[PDB]
């Protein structure tokens, strides 16, 4: 009876508690992230928090380079995050090997969502307490953002946000698009899209950021990369000379 | 480990009963009633479609009567999906037999096989039994017309008239009352409809809620014929037997 | 090879099989019965590879007996021959094939007619009035083709066989040491212990 | 093509006295017309007062002796240090050899 | 529930402990080792007068020099006997000699703990321990006549005399006083026959009891009823003679 | 409800995995051990509680080497630690076999990480009862790491775990602040000996034995070597002196 | 490691109910309404695209999927389960039929296959039933147009028209009032759009509604020409615009 | 892949799954066997919970394992089929390898072994069946009667019964069967068998089937009348007193 | 508490304990006593053999693994047979493949690792036996203590079993003394028999009650029982 809350089987209400609890684990890191699409690029911003002084800050990241073109940011415990990243990389490599072309961002997303859906149905596998946000500049769809959860669900976004204060960042962005009337940041350079991202990240969270409080990922035609404390600092400086 | 969530579907109760089999039967007892009556010149299979709607496409439907062979058919009572798994293996067993011996499979041999498969889910593997009860109507040149029945336990028996599903008790009593060894297919067809008609949990017994089938040796031929009545054919035989 | 002859007369099937068993240079035995009773009304003669020969026969027998008991019924000669053909057809594409040729003679109590089946090691089955495996047909088929009649009596059949065996003893290079004859009819299987000089 | 066998020559002799026994063998090991060693022991003391020599293809002879010695060791472990009678050693060696009935140890062994 | 190979807080394997409880309910079996051979006796204990008592086989031959008696869930012993017989025959095939009694026993005991649902040690495929104990008696050159007690725990002990089954504690106490290094095969037979009589619910007779022995000379033999009926008579007399 | 802490892969209502958390308790209960990254290598040190005079000194080595350039030390259930090192070894051999080059520290860390994280995915296994500090020198520098039972791991400037983990972390933070330009192989070896002695106050009851090992590009050529004899006593004294 | 769950997670209770299947049906009940209407010359399946956020792009998520070029499906219940079921359905359509007979399976057979996959998740070791109910519409030369419903138990039944999910009871009622055996495809599309309106609370346009049909062959959607017998797919997803056009004549 | 230990020991040294397997046997229709001096007779009662059956085709209680051996049982019908099939197969295998049909004891020991194995193998429950196996060893004339139970234990009996009310019927037999003088006739042997079933069948000319096994594969089942004739002659013996 | 976290090895208690393993450790304590000690030339094993009745034998407690290695057991006998057997193979493998005698330290690591696999997997149970391994290799005499938890330790001496604490204090006291008993086997054996009788209470070591074993510089691991140990009682 009471075991319908330990493994992934239906509860009398037709619910899957373990999947629900896995969702709870995604906020364990107290990190917030958001992604927006530029005119020809995709940017993902995520908070970086290094409490312990004994830690080497350069190794504390929740953003991963899945492939030459796909970037993935994770919201959830790091061990499950790395499990998902390794799998994604393997899946991307194998796909290119078998089909002759780079795995599209939305397809990798679906693949990972499907994998997650399985932990939802088979009782011996637990779900992963993570939410995966994949980004890239697809060669057929252009700037792309696809996010998957422990439920095995996934969808494409104009822009999105994940984390404890996900709702604030989301409504902030929603409002901005109701205004601009377009589904993206009408900017030619990614540097400006990165700035917009950091700006609204601030308006919504009501907080200031130093060069080590952020982590940034950028996807462009044929390439995805992360910025350095200094590349970010340069971004921070520019937003400062406008406010 | 896993053991914590294992129901142990194949154990004995302190009374020596098989829980899952008992419960499976309980489940079947709520399934639409299916009847089988064996005449001297044929066999009748009639079943009541449990629950219906006006929008239900009753022409392309077949939830209770399935052709297993060219000389064997079954009436289903229980989980349709479970029954299809078994029906399909039964269909295959029949053909393996035909390929091996170049002769149609003797009815009991096919029934015993399906029953042994059911019996298996009862003794090992830790899986739930099939929530299905079958009424087999068939003919072979060794025992002629035969009527069998198999339930979740994997046990099977032969009958002259039998019912599975809901109200089998009331139904069995009615059959035991009007059955006569020298009956004729048409007599049986009527007994079948009358019996269902009195045990139904519904208002009336309309054609849209019925499936009918007969296995006759059409005098004008010399061979056996299986007929799964079409909606119209049912609506007809339903007016004739005075049930309009 | 050995001699395996079969003939289906009016109310029975007769199977004549050579008695010699030769291993290389010497004739090891001259009273070998190259036959197995598959059921009260079905007999099977066989010839071929040294060990596979009896191994197959006995394997087929065990299976028919098991069927008989499980069903308390006797399979028709036709059903038995189809089972046997399928077994040989499996064998031909296996790792090491049974190199055995067989004749199945049975009396179908339901049809009330004798039946003769010829099946070679490839699983090639055919029903015939009379048949043989190996070189046997080469010497005898011209005789059978001539004197054979569907209404022959068991006695007429044994005479036609005797004629066949005489031709074999005349033109065939090998001394097969005579044959053992058996009859299959409505009353089971019996052996003609007197063909050495019938 | 690859031939898994070779011939290292050698000759061994075993004579059973009345209360003694001898097992001799030259110490020359060869390959075709060349000498590999002028002194390569070919007769071994295997414990429990049993001497053995597996002559023919050296690699096989070595593997067999090695396997038998190890067999004696386990005999002790398994049967409370009981001594292995020469007749028991012989039967054991038969099984060691027949275990490779289809990829034989190319040796003529004497104990 | 709880793993079939779980330890109790006392450091014991539940399943094995419960296994022993089952053995206590079994028929009594007694073994006595003398420098003239080993005697093995058992309580037939038929459950109904209609049961043909000689079809009760609780004393079996393992090889010509090894015999064994069982007590507890007897059916569980068939495979053990089978394993034992094979082990002896195999040993002979591999070494052209008789297997040592202790080695034969060790082989049997190796099966004992091979149970569980997937224990990380090999492939112990057996749902539960054996519900029977065995008295293994035989002879070999290195250690002469021997009697062993093989339990479902995997451990086995060598005894000069031993009783297993429902009458064990009682019978064991008896054997304690009755046994001495100079017993004769004859004495031992009566002694086993006597102690069985004390612990058996039924009046011991050549039909609900059975004797046997193993001697270097004639191997393992199972005394037929006649031969035992007399050893019984001979006992009644010696007891009544004081 | 409850019982969430009885099986390994279960998420509690708050999203935690209690079994992993309980494993951590087995870690905090063990000896204290540390790692100190320096300007061209790493130093590992550990506390070896002396149960009695019977323990042969210098014999029960706890620090382990993986390949030829990696050091690993851990606190908690020692057998779990060895199990983890054996895997690290196969992982390293595998990597070298295919890529020729000895496995990078970051790469090696993730191999261990994925393996440990794997033991938190099923209820048929239990999590590891150790936290492991490990590292070495590779193609581009020195790397220090600490891996938790949850499979979590990060790169450290200095790291500690076990009974006296707080003392150690305290000492490490001071070193980090008072040496922004970097410590040296030679220095870190002494500094390590000190931190172990201080951190021993949370277990001051039983007498202990010190063990240090290092891997410095200049002092060991980039290979992992144990600190013995002179250099060892020299550091022991540097500690004994500052513990007063 | 290794799945040690080799026993059923779905078993019979004393009353004879199969808990997990019941519970799965409950999950289907909470699901967004979807429906199917069969006309004399076509079938229509539709549902509401309940976007989880205005930042999400509802087009990147299809609730109505093409299984074969003459068969489509829609559902109610757990989206992720539906998604994998579709992949398996498309694949089984090939491996168990197209690769054997050289043609796509008839609607009833494919449904039969899907039903089997779902039935197994009801009895196989270590799994839970799928939390979805499908509505599959298709056409084949010998059966014409057909509409089926497949439930978690693996049971499937043919319909003239029906609805599943949230407001299925209300919707099924509204359908019994407007259905007859003479509806033309466009009439059914209309009735469908009306039925769906009762279930939708907020926006009701071509971007919030997903609708597809099984009608005539679209040689324009074939991709090639040159083979007379190949006339194109009978399945077609209506475009955002096509929907709005009909919404005006609502 | 399922290997849960279903048959395990409980604190008191008992194996419940096996014990409960016996409860299933106590619930099965009664079965009795008695050996005469030149034969063995097997009797089994027929339920009456439902009557409108087709006796021609409905599986009978006595089964032939080979031409000289028969087996009857009490307990789960479906379970008995699995044992009967294995038995029949083993009987044919024995003839094929030993070149001699099985002895009754051999065939019994084989079925018992199969039963024992299902009491200590993972993922399976014991057989809810108890059997009576009777017949004549090849080229022998001394009758054989054996019994097996879920535990895997077996033994021979002069006469024995199993199933529901077997308690009653065994008592009848213990004070009506003299080993000194066994039913020297096939007739008086069958009579004793019917007599014992009447103590529990409560008038059932159609509720008592009998099979007589004589040496050399001479097995034959009686008909309602033949049996009913014994019923008739037996009821008078009572009234004529 | 405990009752909810001791149903199997795969479960940690809230305090971080592994009860099934602890229950295994208990089977050891309940076992007979055995002692081990070494000089720099020899290593000795002394163990008290236990019997069932006065009609039963005294179950052996010492097993030889190779010519240079052996051990004494405490707890479940069968598990010692399994572990000693695995050790016998490892030694054998080391000789056949590398023609090298297996280092006692390495034999300890092998035992530790084998035992550990039984404390992290489902369905498996921990070994319920303690082992004292002695042996002479290329680095001298050695004594190891093996615990079912997988913990192996190298010592100059130690003991396990019931009342083992007696002998352990004695040895820890006698240390400096016996450690130097080089070139003199009989002196180390007596020193060992003295440590073991420090755990007596029930009775006094008899002839068929005492069991001694030794290995060393030029002494192949050999076992003494009965009359052979008479000169030590």
UniProtKB/Swiss-Prot annotation, chain A:
Entries under PANTHER family matching the protein: PROTEASOME SUBUNIT ALPHA/BETA (PTHR11599)
Bilayer-crossing regions: none
Similarity annotation: Belongs to the peptidase T1A family.
GO biological process: proteasomal ubiquitin-independent protein catabolic process; proteasome-mediated ubiquitin-dependent protein catabolic process
Name listed for the protein in its UniProt record: Proteasome subunit alpha type-1
Extra information: Present with 15200 molecules/cell in log phase SD medium.
Function: The proteasome degrades poly-ubiquitinated proteins in the cytoplasm and in the nucleus. It is essential for the regulated turnover of proteins and for the removal of misfolded proteins. The proteasome is a multicatalytic proteinase complex that is characterized by its ability to cleave peptides with Arg, Phe, Tyr, Leu, and Glu adjacent to the leaving group at neutral or slightly basic pH. It has an ATP-dependent proteolytic activity.
Annotated gene: SCL1
Swiss-Prot record, chain C:
InterPro entries found in the cross-reference section: Ntn_hydrolases_N, Proteasome_beta2, Proteasome_bsu_CS, Proteasome_sua/b, Proteasome_suB-type
Keyword Cytoplasm set for record: yes
GO CC terms of this entry: cytosol; endoplasmic reticulum membrane; nucleus; proteasome complex; proteasome core complex, beta-subunit complex
Entry's localization field: Cytoplasm; Nucleus
PROSITE patterns: PROTEASOME_BETA_1, PROTEASOME_BETA_2
Misc remark: Present with 21800 molecules/cell in log phase SD medium.
Taxonomic source organism: Saccharomyces cerevisiae (strain ATCC 204508 / S288c)
Positions carrying N-acetylmethionine: 1
One Pfam family named in its UniProt record: Proteasome
GO biological processes: proteasomal ubiquitin-independent protein catabolic process; proteasome-mediated ubiquitin-dependent protein catabolic process
Phosphoserine PTM positions: 76
Gene Ontology molecular functions: endopeptidase activator activity
Keyword Glycoprotein among record annotations: no
Residues that span the membrane, as ranges: none
Protein name, as recorded: Proteasome subunit beta type-4
Family: Belongs to the peptidase T1B family.
Keywords in alphabetical order: Acetylation, Cytoplasm, Nucleus, Phosphoprotein, Proteasome
Subunit details: The 26S proteasome consists of a 20S proteasome core and two 19S regulatory subunits. The 20S proteasome core is composed of 28 subunits that are arranged in four stacked rings, resulting in a barrel-shaped structure. The two end rings are each formed by seven alpha subunits, and the two central rings are each formed by seven beta subunits. The catalytic chamber with the active sites is on the inside of the barrel.
Swiss-Prot record, chain G:
InterPro entries in the cross-refs: Ntn_hydrolases_N (IPR029055), Proteasome_alpha (IPR050115), Proteasome_alpha-type (IPR023332), Proteasome_asu_N (IPR000426), Proteasome_sua/b (IPR001353)
GO CC annotation terms, alphabetical: nucleus; proteasome complex; proteasome core complex, alpha-subunit complex; proteasome storage granule
Protein name: Proteasome subunit alpha type-2
Places the protein is found: Cytoplasm; Nucleus
Protein's job: The proteasome degrades poly-ubiquitinated proteins in the cytoplasm and in the nucleus. It is essential for the regulated turnover of proteins and for the removal of misfolded proteins. The proteasome is a multicatalytic proteinase complex that is characterized by its ability to cleave peptides with Arg, Phe, Tyr, Leu, and Glu adjacent to the leaving group at neutral or slightly basic pH. It has an ATP-dependent proteolytic activity.
Main location: cytoplasm
UniProt KW keywords: Cytoplasm, Isopeptide bond, Nucleus, Proteasome, Ubl conjugation
Organism whose genome encodes this protein: Saccharomyces cerevisiae (strain ATCC 204508 / S288c)
Higher taxonomy: Eukaryota, Fungi, Dikarya, Ascomycota, Saccharomycotina
Other remarks on this protein: Present with 7060 molecules/cell in log phase SD medium.
Ubl conjugation keyword on record: yes
Pfam families, per database record: Proteasome, Proteasome_A_N
Cross-link (Glycyl lysine isopeptide (Lys-Gly) (interchain with G-Cter in ubiquitin)): 108
Similarity comment: family membership: Belongs to the peptidase T1A family.
GO biological process, any: proteasome-mediated ubiquitin-dependent protein catabolic process
Keyword Nucleus among UniProt keywords: yes
UniProtKB/Swiss-Prot annotation, chain I:
Subcellular location: Cytoplasm; Nucleus
Covalent cross-link Glycyl lysine isopeptide (Lys-Gly) (interchain with G-Cter in ubiquitin) as placed by the record, residue numbers: 190
Main subcellular location: cytoplasm
Top-level taxonomic group: Eukaryota
Keyword Nucleus applies: yes
Modified residues annotated as Phosphoserine in this record: 13
Keywords, in A-Z order: Cytoplasm, Isopeptide bond, Nucleus, Phosphoprotein, Proteasome, Ubl conjugation
InterPro entries (UniProt xref): Ntn_hydrolases_N, Proteasome_alpha, Proteasome_alpha-type, Proteasome_asu_N, Proteasome_sua/b
GO BP annotation list: proteasomal ubiquitin-independent protein catabolic process; proteasome-mediated ubiquitin-dependent protein catabolic process
Entry's Gene Ontology cellular component terms: nucleus; proteasome complex; proteasome core complex, alpha-subunit complex; proteasome storage granule
Record keyword Phosphoprotein present: yes
Function: The proteasome degrades poly-ubiquitinated proteins in the cytoplasm and in the nucleus. It is essential for the regulated turnover of proteins and for the removal of misfolded proteins. The proteasome is a multicatalytic proteinase complex that is characterized by its ability to cleave peptides with Arg, Phe, Tyr, Leu, and Glu adjacent to the leaving group at neutral or slightly basic pH. It has an ATP-dependent proteolytic activity.
Additional notes on this entry: Present with 7210 molecules/cell in log phase SD medium.
Protein name in UniProt: Proteasome subunit alpha type-6
Gene: PRE5
